[PDB]
Each structure stands twice: as C-alpha cells, then as structure tokens.
Amino acid sequence: MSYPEKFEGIAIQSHEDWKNPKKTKYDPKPFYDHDIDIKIEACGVCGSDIHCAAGHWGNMKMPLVVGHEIVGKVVKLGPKSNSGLKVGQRVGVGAQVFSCLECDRCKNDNEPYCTKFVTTYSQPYEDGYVSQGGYANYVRVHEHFVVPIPENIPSHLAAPLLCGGLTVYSPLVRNGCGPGKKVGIVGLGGIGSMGTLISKAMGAETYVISRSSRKREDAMKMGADHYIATLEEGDWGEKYFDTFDLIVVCASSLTDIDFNIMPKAMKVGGRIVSISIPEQHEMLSLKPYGLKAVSISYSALGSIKELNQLLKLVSEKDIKIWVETLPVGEAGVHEAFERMEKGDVRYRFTLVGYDKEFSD
Amino acid sequence: MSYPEKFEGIAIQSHEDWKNPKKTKYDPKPFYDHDIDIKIEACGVCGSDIHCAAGHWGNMKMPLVVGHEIVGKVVKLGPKSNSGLKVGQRVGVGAQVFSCLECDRCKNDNEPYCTKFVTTYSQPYEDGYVSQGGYANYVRVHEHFVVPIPENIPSHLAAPLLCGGLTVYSPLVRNGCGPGKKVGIVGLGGIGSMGTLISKAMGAETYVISRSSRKREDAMKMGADHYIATLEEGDWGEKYFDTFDLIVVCASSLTDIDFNIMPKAMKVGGRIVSISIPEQHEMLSLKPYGLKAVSISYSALGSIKELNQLLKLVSEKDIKIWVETLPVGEAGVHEAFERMEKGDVRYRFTLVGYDKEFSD
Ligand SMILES: NC(=O)c1ccc[n+]([C@@H]2O[C@H](COP(=O)([O-])OP(=O)(O)OC[C@H]3O[C@@H](n4cnc5c(N)ncnc54)[C@H](OP(=O)(O)O)[C@@H]3O)[C@@H](O)[C@H]2O)c1
Numbered sequence: 001m002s003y004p005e006k007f008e009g010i011a012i013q014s015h016e017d018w019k020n021p022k023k024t025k026y027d028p029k030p031f032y033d034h035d036i037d038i039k040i041e042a043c044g045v046c047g048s049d050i051h052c053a054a055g056h057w058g059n060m061k062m063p064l065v066v067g068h069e070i071v072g073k074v075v076k077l078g079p080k081s082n083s084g085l086k087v088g089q090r091v092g093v094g095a096q097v098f099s100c101l102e103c104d105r106c107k108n109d110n111e112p113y114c115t116k117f118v119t120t121y122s123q124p125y126e127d128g129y130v131s132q133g134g135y136a137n138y139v140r141v142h143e144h145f146v147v148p149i150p151e152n153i154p155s156h157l158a159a160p161l162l163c164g165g166l167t168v169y170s171p172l173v174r175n176g177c178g179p180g181k182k183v184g185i186v187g188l189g190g191i192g193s194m195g196t197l198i199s200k201a202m203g204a205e206t207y208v209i210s211r212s213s214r215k216r217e218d219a220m221k222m223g224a225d226h227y228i229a230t231l232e233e234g235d236w237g238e239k240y241f242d243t244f245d246l247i248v249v250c251a252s253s254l255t256d257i258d259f260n261i262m263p264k265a266m267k268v269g270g271r272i273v274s275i276s277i278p279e280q281h282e283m284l285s286l287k288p289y290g291l292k293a294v295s296i297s298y299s300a301l302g303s304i305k306e307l308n309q310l311l312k313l314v315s316e317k318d319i320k321i322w323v324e325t326l327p328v329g330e331a332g333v334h335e336a337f338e339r340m341e342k343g344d345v346r347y348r349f350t351l352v353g354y355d356k357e358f359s360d
Numbered sequence: 361m362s363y364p365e366k367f368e369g370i371a372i373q374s375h376e377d378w379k380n381p382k383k384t385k386y387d388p389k390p391f392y393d394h395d396i397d398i399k400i401e402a403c404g405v406c407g408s409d410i411h412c413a414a415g416h417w418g419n420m421k422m423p424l425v426v427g428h429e430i431v432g433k434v435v436k437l438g439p440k441s442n443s444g445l446k447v448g449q450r451v452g453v454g455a456q457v458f459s460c461l462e463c464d465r466c467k468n469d470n471e472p473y474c475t476k477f478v479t480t481y482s483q484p485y486e487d488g489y490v491s492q493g494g495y496a497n498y499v500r501v502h503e504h505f506v507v508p509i510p511e512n513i514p515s516h517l518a519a520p521l522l523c524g525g526l527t528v529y530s531p532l533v534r535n536g537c538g539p540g541k542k543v544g545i546v547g548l549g550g551i552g553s554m555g556t557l558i559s560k561a562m563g564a565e566t567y568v569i570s571r572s573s574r575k576r577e578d579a580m581k582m583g584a585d586h587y588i589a590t591l592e593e594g595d596w597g598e599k600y601f602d603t604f605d606l607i608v609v610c611a612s613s614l615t616d617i618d619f620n621i622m623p624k625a626m627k628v629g630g631r632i633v634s635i636s637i638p639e640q641h642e643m644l645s646l647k648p649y650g651l652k653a654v655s656i657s658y659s660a661l662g663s664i665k666e667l668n669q670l671l672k673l674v675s676e677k678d679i680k681i682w683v684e685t686l687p688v689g690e691a692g693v694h695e696a697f698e699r700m701e702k703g704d705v706r707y708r709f710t711l712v713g714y715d716k717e718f719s720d
Pocket residue numbers: 046047048051095163164167186187188189190191192209210211212215250251252253254255256257275276277278299300301302340343347
C-alpha cells in the first residue's frame with residue numbers, strides 16, 4: 001500500500017531466476033525508538049548483492065530486496081531517536097544495520113565484529129524479521145548506522161562509499177596507509193577502483209595489481225603510481241620483492257589468486273589483508289612457509305566512525321569515483337545483475353531514478 | 361689436531377644413528393677479516409638440533425656438529441675485526457652466523473630475513489663450507505653475530521637465550537607485549553618456558569596455553585597469570601573469546617594444534633604468531649573464514665639488536681630460566697638427544713663441562 005504500512009522495491013523472487021527481480025510490496029521491520037525511516041533515492045549495486053541474489057551464500061528466504069549502499073532522505077525519526085538527524089535530512093546507510101552497542105567492541109568502534117551484528121539484508125533480526133531494503137522506496141534503519149552525507153558529494157557518487165569504499169578504507173587506515181607507504185590493490189573491480197583513489201588520497205604510493213593488462217589505462221587515470229599485470233610476469237613477487245607494507249585483496253573470487261608468491265613482495269612486517277567472501281565452498285589456500293614475517297587476515301566493513309572519516313576525506317580533497325547510473329526498477333536491476341557478472345562495469349553501478357519509479 | 365688448524369666436537373655420523381654422536385675432528389671454516397674464533401664452554405640443546413640431527417629437515421651432510429645457543433671465550437679476532445670485542449672476552453653466538461649487512465633489511469635490523477642469511481650449522485656458506493659448531497671446543501663466527509654477555513648472567517643460564525629466548529622475544533617486542541596486553545604462550549616447551557618469563561618480565565598478563573594439565577605447577581611458578589588446558593575445554597576459543605592481543609605458538613609440531621578455534625579468543629586486531637618449523641611435510645592448515653580481523657604469520661630468530669635488549673632485560677630484572685645441565689661429550693648429547701624426544705626436560709638442556717672434555 002503506502003509508506004506508513006507496506007514497503008515497495010524490486011525483489012528477487014527466487015535464486016533460480018535471480019536475474020529477474022520483480023516490483024514487490026512487503027511488510028517493513030517493526031519500528032523501534034531508535035529506528036528511522038529513510039526514503040531511498042540512490043542505492044549502489046555491490047558485488048555482494050550479486051552473490052546473495054545468486055545463492056553463493058546459501059539459500060536466502062524470498063522475496064528479498066537487495067542493496068546496501070543506500071543514500072536517501074530522512075522521513076521519520078523514532079521516539080527515543082537522537083543523534084542530530086533532522087527529518088528530511090540527507091543520510092546514508094551501509095552494510096551494517098544493527099549491533100548491540102554495549103560490548104567492548106561496539107564501544108570501541110568495531111561494530112562490524114559485534115556478536116549481535118546484523119547486515120542490511122537477508123539476515124533476520126533478533127526479533128525474526130529478515131532485513132530488506134536497498135532496491136526499494138524507503139528503508140527502516142537503527143539511527144546509529146544512518147550517517148550524514150556532505151553536500152558537495154553527489155548522491156549517485158556517495159552511495160558506493162557506504163560499503164565498497166568503507167570496506168577498503170578501514171584496512172587502509174588501520175594498517176598505516178599514508179605518506180611513505182607502498183600500498184598494493186589487488187583486483188581493480190568496484191572496491192578496487194575506490195581502494196586506489198582512497199589510497200592515493202591518503203598519499204601512499206599506490207600500486208594497482210591485476211592479472212591482464214586491460215585496466216592499465218583506467219588504473220592509471222585513477223592515480224596509480226604503478227601498475228602490474230600478473231599474466232605478464234610469471235612471478236611478480238620475485239620482481240617486486242620486498243616492496244609493500246600493505247596489500248588489500250579485493251577479489252570477488254579467490255581462485256585466480258596465487259597466495260604463495262605474494263608474500264615475497266612484502267616488506268618484513270608487511271600485511272596482506274583480504275576483503276573477499278566468495279562462494280561458500282572456496283578457501284584461502286596458501287603454503288604456510290611463506291608467511292615469514294608477513295601476516296594474512298580478513299576484514300569486514302568498517303566502523304561507522306570510519307565510514308565518516310572516509311566521507312570527510314572524499315568531500316575534502318574531492319574524490320571522483322567511477323560510477324555509471326541506472327534506472328531503478330525490474331529493468332535497471334537486471335542490467336546491473338547482468339553486467340556485474342560480466343565485469344562489464346566502469347567499476348560502480350549506482351541505481352537512481354527512485355522518484356519516478358515507485359510512487360506512493 | 362689443535363685449535364689453530366683442526367677443530368673437535370661431537371658430530372652426528374648419519375641421520376640413522378643420529379642418537380649416537382661421536383667425538384670428531386674437522387676442518388674449520390676459512391678465516392676472514394671479520395671472523396672470530398670462540399672457545400665454547402656452554403651450548404644450549406635446542407629443539408632444532410633434534411630435528412636436523414634426525415633428518416626432519418631433509419638429508420644433511422655428515423659429519424655434522426650441531427648446537428647454536430653458544431657461549432664462550434674470545435680467542436682470536438680478525439684483521440679487519442672491530443666492534444669492541446676484547447680477546448678472552450665472554451661472548452655468545454646464536455642461530456644466525458652470517459648475513460650480507462648491506463641490504464635495507466640488514467641495515468634495518470632484520471638480519472634473519474636477509475637474502476644471504478646463513479644459519480649456524482648444516483648450511484654451506486657462499487664459499488661452500490657447511491657451517492658447524494655448537495657441540496665442539498670452539499666456533500668460528502663473523503663478529504657481527506657474536507654478542508657480549510652480562511656478567512651477572514651464568515653461562516649455562518645464558519646460552520638458551522641466544523636462540524630460544526630471542527625467538528620468543530622478537531615477536532613479543534615487535535607486537536607490543538607490555539603493560540595492559542594479554543599475551544598467550546602456546547606450548548610450554550623450552551622456548552615456551554622462556555616466552556612466559558620474558559612475557560611476564562615485560563609486564564604483560566601472561567596466559568600459558570597447553571593441552572594437558574601436567575605443566576600447571578611449573579607454568580604457575582614461572583609467573584603465568586593464568587593457565588589453560590586444551591584437553592579440559594572442548595573449545596577454549598569460545599570461553600576465552602575476545603581476550604588476547606598476542607599469541608605466540610611455540611610448538612615442535614603443528615598437528616595437535618587446532619587453528620580454527622584460536623582466532624575466537626583474539627581481540628579484533630589480535631595476532632597469532634607461530635615460531636615453529638616441523639617435519640618438512642606439515643603445514644599450517646586453518647579455515648580461512650576465521651581470520652576475521654585476526655592475522656597469522658610466522659617469525660624467524662631475531663635481530664642481533666634485539667638479542668641484546670633481551671640479554672639486557674634478563675640481566676636487569678634477573679630472569680631465572682629453567683635449565684638442566686649435562687656433560688658435553690658422546691654421552692651427555694645422547695641423553696639430551698633422548699630426553700628431548702620425550703619432552704623429558706625441565707625445559708632447557710645446557711651442555712657444559714666443555715673444559716675437561718676435549719683438551720688441545
Ligand atoms: N568484508 C566485507 O565487508 C565486504 C563488503 C562488501 C563486499 N565484500 C566482497 O567483495 C567482493 C565484491 O567486490 P566488488 O563489488 O568491488 O567486486 P566486483 O566489482 O564484483 O569485481 C570483482 C573483481 O575481483 C576480481 N576477480 C573476479 N573474479 C576473480 C577470480 N576468479 N579470481 C581472482 N580475481 C577475480 C576482478 O579484478 P581484475 O580482473 O582487475 O584482476 C574483478 O574486478 C565479493 O567477494 C564480496 O563478497 C566484502
């Protein structure tokens with residue numbers, strides 16, 4: 001029906017026909033004192049959307065609206081709400097939609113690693129409602145995770161940062177990525193493109209690292225102080241031996257990723273940090289011997305504290321990420337859900353045209 | 361014959377009868393301007409001695425004197441020598457006997473990770489001589505790796521530190537192990553006992569972590585602020601969830617070591633650092649998923665810069681490690697080479713009685 005009660009968006013009808021989302025109307029999550037209702041106007045098509053919609057992450061309950069790089073307008077604060085959010089204000093939610101905010105971790109800015117963590121979609125809340133939102137009219141989120149968007153940042157250009165940008169940002173800041181450091185980005189995909197700008201933005205000699213040579217022109221436009229083509233090396237770890245401090249692996253999969261060479265190109269004390277979560281069958285397989293004064297580990301999202309620093313950073317030195325917009329609705333989604341599985345994107349797909357698409 | 365030319369020690373005759381070393385006389389490494397000749401008087405029986413003597417590390421060339429926790433008297437500096445070493449002075453060599461000292465790594469205190477690295481024994485130098493020393497009268501080492509021993513530190517009690525102590529020390533200091541930190545030591549063996557004292561010594565709430573409950577009394581004498589028995593837990597990672605910053609795995613093998621539970625007991629940003637090098641068949645096998653904001657990596661020896669800080673530290677707050685001396689010579693070695701493979705040691709075996717054993 002209408003906003004008060006029923007919500008509407010483009011939802012996956014089943015993993016089988018996942019490439020065919022349909023306009024749907026569903027029941028919103030029950031409202032709570034800190035919750036907030038945001039009318040969406042721009043969501044970013046993230047690689048994670050594709051995996052879930054497909055089913056690489058187990059069978060998800062359908063219907064199921066996807067999308068978690070949300071940017072919209074505030075349209076209803078909650079009783080005990082409070083944080084500075086004016087109604088009708090421009091905000092944005094990312095991949096985390098809940099946390100308990102009391103454990104040492106939450107209180108210490110590590111909400112992604114909280115025991116009570118709940119992602120923006122396909123996960124039921126402690127009350128049983130399976131999160132939704134993203135490719136729909138509005139989203140209902142707990143005010144702690146809804147952030148403010150600087151004005152000098154376009155909506156279609158901000159959304160991608162709520163997840164993809166934050167995800168690369170977090171391990172970069174946390175691992176000392178600034179003047180003097182040699183940072184390598186592995187996989188110039190969506191998050192890979194942002195990781196290179198953000199890396200440069202923080203003033204760190206950035207090295208983009210892909211397989212083919214196809215993306216050399218782009219990676220070079222982005223600011224990459226050097227590029228590397230895996231296929232044209234036979235063993236790059238030996239050539240770039242002892243060079244990097246940090247390396248962030250941003251790859252949809254982890255098969256065409258050799259983890260027994262990489263360690264060589266690391267400084268003693270270097271750090272290989274992966275961001276991926278592939279088909280629930282894969283594994284990070286690498287010979288143990290090679291982690292000689294070189295560590296490996298995985299990282300999830302980032303703290304809403306950081307999601308801000310990022311936005312602040314982009315806003316300041318004006319970071320122009322690479323986004324190609326689409327018409328929200330059964331069509332635009334399909335295309336995105338098509339071209340993403342073809343790597344056929346100028347890195348980030350940002351659905352827009354939310355307005356002339358749903359109507360009350 | 362005599363010191364000038366021929367050297368003498370107890371050498372493995374073959375991997376087969378490795379439990380039966382024999383008194384032997386062998387050709388020393390050619391002398392060089394920075395080299396030094398040290399008359400040994402106390403070597404520490406390290407777990408690595410056993411693996412090599414046995415053959416877990418491929419077939420080594422025999423004869424082969426083993427032992428690399430050496431403490432002795434200076435008996436002949438080299439032409440271009442220089443560093444402050446007085447002849448007849450008390451010094452000690454560890455596991456590294458060579459490095460190129462010019463690369464960024466050497467110049468930056470990471471000699472263990474140097475490309476030209478050479479260990480104290482079983483490795484030929486760039487000139488072809490296969491390092492020896494340890495369970496013998498004297499050892500010929502490049503002055504950069506021969507360190508000074510504080511007087512208030514007994515010889516039989518210092519030797520163990522040259523390798524075992526340094527090996528635990530390095531990752532502790534490098535990873536911030538001091539006031540406020542929760543450090544866990546996994547495997548109260550030789551290096552495990554030292555890791556607990558050194559850990560406490562640096563004022564860090566130390567947690568010894570073994571399988572059985574056998575070593576609770578000792579680990580508790582050492583100062584361990586808490587002990588944990590793997591076998592009496594079923595899943596300790598869940599009980600000690602989110603507790604440690606650092607964990608140093610000091611285990612001869614890596615089989616009875618489950619690496620899919622550990623990560624749970626780590627703080628976000630914690631670090632699991634292994635020190636082991638088992639049979640050349642084993643591997644560090646652990647589910648990839650669990651390294652969520654938790655890294656794993658391996659570490660080798662330590663920089664001679666640190667091998668000093670350690671000695672300084674022990675000397676200062678007087679660190680009494682657990683050593684049980686033995687009579688150098690075909691016998692004492694045998695015993696050590698026996699009890700070590702039975703974990704039948706009060707942690708460290710230090711051969712002594714070098715004097716009334718070889719003679720000129
Ligand atoms: N931990 C977190 O918080 C978090 C948050 C969001 C997403 N993720 C994960 O991030 C990934 C999606 O990132 P994205 O949206 O930026 O990616 P994407 O745009 O979907 O592109 C994937 C990129 O990874 C590389 N790639 C694809 N197939 C590969 C294969 N078989 N082997 C090696 N590399 C391959 C490609 O790089 P080149 O061809 O240039 O080498 C490609 O550009 C997913 O795995 C998702 O689950 C994690």
